Chain A
Amino acid sequence: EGEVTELTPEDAENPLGGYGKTISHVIVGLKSAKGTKTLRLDPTIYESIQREKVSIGDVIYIEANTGAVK
């Protein structure tokens, strides 16, 4: 849990090629009271981020084993 500070997907080589733009991880940086970290989450998080319409400056709640955000 923490305020969202960074939201960047890292491009990686496509196993199937096709000249498309692929992402292997989505990077979320959360800052807290006496604490801050950056997470290399799996690409699946993009659906939950879109559904919860989060933004920079928002504080969010992401379950470690489920992958959902709130």
Chain B
Amino acid sequence: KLNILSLDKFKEQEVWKKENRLALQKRQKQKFQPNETILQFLSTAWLMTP
């Protein structure tokens, strides 16, 4: 019983660690200016019908 308790605790800890690593990577990927206005230029192929 005690070992099952410890095992579920360890599983939760491992899931938390992996998710936190993924979140840190995502936060690293999102490096940009905070809450600033942005000017965007877009060009794309546009389909046409009569």
A interface residue numbers (CB < 8 A to B): 15-16, 20, 43-44
Are B40's CB and A20's CB within 8 A? yes
Interface size class of B (residues with CB under 8 A): under 10
Q: How far is the CB of A12 from chain B (nearest CB, A)?
A: 11
For A20, what are the chain B residues with a Cβ–Cβ distance below 8 Å? 40
Interface of B is mostly: loop
Answer yes or no: B48 CB below 8 A from chain A CBs: no
B interface residue numbers (CB < 8 A to A): 40-42, 44
Listed A/B pairs (6) with beta-carbon separation below 8 Å: A15-B42, A15-B44, A16-B42, A20-B40, A43-B41, A44-B41
For A15, what are the chain B residues with a Cβ–Cβ distance below 8 Å? 42, 44
**Which residue of chain A is the closest to B44 with respect to CB atoms?**
A15
For A43, what are the chain B residues with a Cβ–Cβ distance below 8 Å? 41
Q: How far is the CB of A6 from chain B (nearest CB, A)?
A: 23
For A16, what are the chain B residues with a Cβ–Cβ distance below 8 Å? 42
Q: How far is the CB of A66 from chain B (nearest CB, A)?
A: 17
